[model samples]
Target: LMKVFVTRRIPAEGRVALARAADCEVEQWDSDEPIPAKELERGVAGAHGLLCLLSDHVDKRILDAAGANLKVISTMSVGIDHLALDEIKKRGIRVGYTPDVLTDTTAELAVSLLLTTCRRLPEAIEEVKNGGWTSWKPLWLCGYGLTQSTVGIIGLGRIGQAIARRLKPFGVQRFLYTGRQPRPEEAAEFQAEFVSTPELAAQSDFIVVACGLCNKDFFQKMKETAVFINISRGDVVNQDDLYQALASGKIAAAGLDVTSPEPLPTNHPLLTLKNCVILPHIGSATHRTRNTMSLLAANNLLAGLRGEPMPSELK
Candidate 1:
């Protein structure tokens, strides 16, 4: 019988999938919280397969404790950055990751974030809570609109293009993108013009960074009325600089779906700003997408244990 260690609780189908699989005796740490690193090292010992989350840091120590029986490690995210890729490779342990399944859900959330920031939804909602909306005024709560706007996407990959596609009907006048090189075919779909980073920043009315390729200096280049929306990794931007810019009015508003650190601190300056909105990295938070994502991760683990081709394996 093959032994497997799951770092934390997953969706129902994912759990059931492993539970019903033959000869696969699973010992999963049942919790909604992050599995402590020491516990991961212990739970993974003598296991033939290991299933973990992106939050779990699977490094050299955990793999060392796994014994030679460990043949597979499956992560429940498209991101494998948390895993020790080199060590796993050297140990000949194949890794699996859920990819492409959450694309639409992620795209939809970014668009929602962009609109929420520009429309000042959070601020408007607070007005009702404070009884500040006793009656409506003509000039009250007016916010930016997408009509005839220029949107720049920094990385025009699957999620990036999908964002542009969804935003296309919002009456956006232009789509500008920057990347390593132009993907003419993809760019052609949205008529997305290839521009230099500085130019994209300067001209775009709103910018969605699906890729990590920005820092302190770039924030200053954006227009004062620009709505900055980021759906990528948080460390891409300098948080301190971003806070200063929003506080000082270097930019109009900002929305973030991802932060440098998960669960950004309550006292973080960015969170204190009325113009800055931060989400808890819920880019793929929809129940349906996450359910499928968890199932995909489970399937990969099952395939690897059976010596069959995994649906999505690390190269």
Candidate 2:
């Protein structure tokens, strides 16, 4: 039997898929939260496959622990930065990730975050809770709107394009995008103007980070007046710079669905700022979307184990 180590508790559908596979030895994670690093090392010692998340780093140390038994790594996320790709490749370990499945859900969350942050929903709620709402004052919390503004998307990938599709009905005057310049066919669908990163940051009224985190320098170049939204990987934004920008009014506001450190500490500076909205990384938390993703991930794992092509294999 091929041993599989799951990093966290996944949906029941995934469990059912594993159970039905007679050639698999499934080692389930007891806790609902992510498995500890040491636990992962121990669990993967003899496992043929490791089911991971974007939050867990499948680094060289973990790879070393898995040793020769690790044949595949399946992550239930679109981004694979957390996994050590070069090392995995060197070791001949195949990778699987869920991409197109979660695009629309993540795109919807990006739009929701954009609107909520711009309208100051968190600040408004706090005012009522703190009794600061003595009476409604004119221009108490007026914010920028998307109707006549230019919006810039950092990445024009699956989720990024999906966000543009959803925002098209919002009457945004301009849509600018950067990163991996989409093909003419793809570009025509969104009516997005391909621009350099600097231009996108400087010209946009609202800036959304849907790109994977690559280098650290780009995060520091964000415009101060731009309302920033990140539904992408947390590492894409420099948390310190983002918090500083929001705190000092360098940036008007920010809505973050993902942060560098998942489940940020209680004393994290971003949480203290009213203008900054942070969520528990629920970009694809819809019941239906998550269920589909779980099933798909299981399917990928099964296919890979059976020496068949995975539904979404990393190329």
Candidate 3:
């Protein structure tokens, strides 16, 4: 029998699949939180393979603890930063990961965040509950709209393109994107224009950073009516500058799915701004999407264990 270690609890679908495998002995940590380091070491010590989350660190200690019996590591996320790639590769261990499964789901969240932040959904909800919802007054609760607006996308990568594709149906007039170079073919459908970062910052009314951190200068270039949305990393933004832009009206509003040092402190200055909207890093939170991720990861682990070509392997 093949001993497999699961670092934490996953969806029922994947759990069922692993359980149904008569030859696979699945030992799970049985928890919602990440498995403790020492416990993970112990669990994998006798495992022939391991399935983990992005939050779990698969480092040298883990690899050593798992010994030569561990031939594969499957993670239920697109990110592999937590893994010690060199160590895994040197040990001739294969890595399988979930990638494309969550693309559409993540894009959906990006579009939703953009709409919610630009339109001030959270603010409106608070107003209604706090008696600020006075009789319909013109210009009250007014926020930006996506119709016929110019959109500046920071990157034209897969997720960026997906976000733009979804936004196109909303009557956007133009899509402008910036990076080291233009992806001409990728931008064709959206009719996205390749522009300098400064130009994109200055010309667009809505900015979806499918990109990395932008400087305060970029913020300064933005139109006073511009709305900024970050579907990228928290460190990808200069938090202080973002707050300054929002607090001083450098830009219209902002929405973020991520922040530097997540679980951004309860009193972070950004939390104080009415125009700033923050979510607790749930870019890939849909139940269906998570189930699919688990299924894909499960497949990867099973395939890798059988010494078959993995679904998505780190070659």
Candidate 4:
């Protein structure tokens, strides 16, 4: 029987599929929390296939512990930065990831985060609970609106385009995008103007970073009143600089779905800011989307072990 090591407990969709597969013995860390490094190294030993999440760092140490029999690595996330690609490639290990399945779901979450930040939803809710809502004044709890606004998107990939599509109906007047090169075909649908990164930051009323190319310098270029949103990786931006920008009013507000540390400490400075909104990386947490991602990851693992083409192999 082939041995498969699951780094953590996955959704039932994936667990059931792996369980029903013939000639496969699956061993799991069996927790929603991450497996400790030492425990992970022990769990992967003598395994032929390894399934993991973004929190698990599949590095040289883990690979060495898995032995030469390990043939595949499948992750339930789209980003592969967590995995040591060079080390895996050196071992000739095939890799798989879930991508397109969560495109719309993630885009939707990006929009939600943007609105929640711009509208000051969390702060407003807090005010109600603290008896600060005695009466509604004309200027009370005023927030930014999308109508007649310029929306800038950093990347025009699947999720980026989806975000633009959803925001268009909100009365966004113009769409601006920046990337390695212009994608005229994709931009045509929304008439998205291709511009330089600095220009996008300066002219946009709302900036949504959907790529891993932004940094502290990029944030410094944004308009003072522009609402910043990031659904991409957190390392793309300097967290300390971001805190300064928000606290010093360099920018109007910021929203993040991903952070440098997965579960940012409650005492973290960013969490104390009223203008900064942070989430626990639930961009693709919808019931349907998560189930699809889990099933796809499971199928990819099965295909790689059977020497067949993975539906979403990372090539």
- What TM-score goes with each of the models? 0.97, 0.91, 0.94, 0.97
TM-score winner between candidates 3 and 4: 4
Please give me the total number of clashing residue pairs in predicted model 4: 0
Distance (Å) between predicted and true CA of 261, model 4?
1.8
Per-candidate Cα lDDT values, in order, are 0.90, 0.82, 0.89, 0.91
For lDDT, the strongest prediction is: 4
Clashing pairs in model 3, backbone N/Cα/C closer than 3 A: 213-236, 234-259
Which ranges in model 2 have alpha carbons more than 4 Å from their true place? Answer: 212-225
TM accuracy, model 2:
0.91
Residue 275 in candidate 3 has what lDDT? 92
RMSD after CA superposition, every candidate? 1.2, 2.5, 1.7, 1.2
lDDT (Cα, 0-100) at 41 in candidate 1: 83
lDDT of 4 at 312: 98
208-249 in candidate 1: lDDT tens per residue? Answer: 998535666888899999899888887788888888888889
Root-mean-square deviation of Cα positions for candidate 4 versus the true structure, in angstroms:
1.2
**Candidate 1 segments whose C-alpha is farther than 4 A from its true place:** none
Clashes of each: 0, 1, 2, 0
Pitting candidate 2 against candidate 3, the one with the higher lDDT is 3
Worst lDDT window (10 residues) for model 2?
A: 212-221
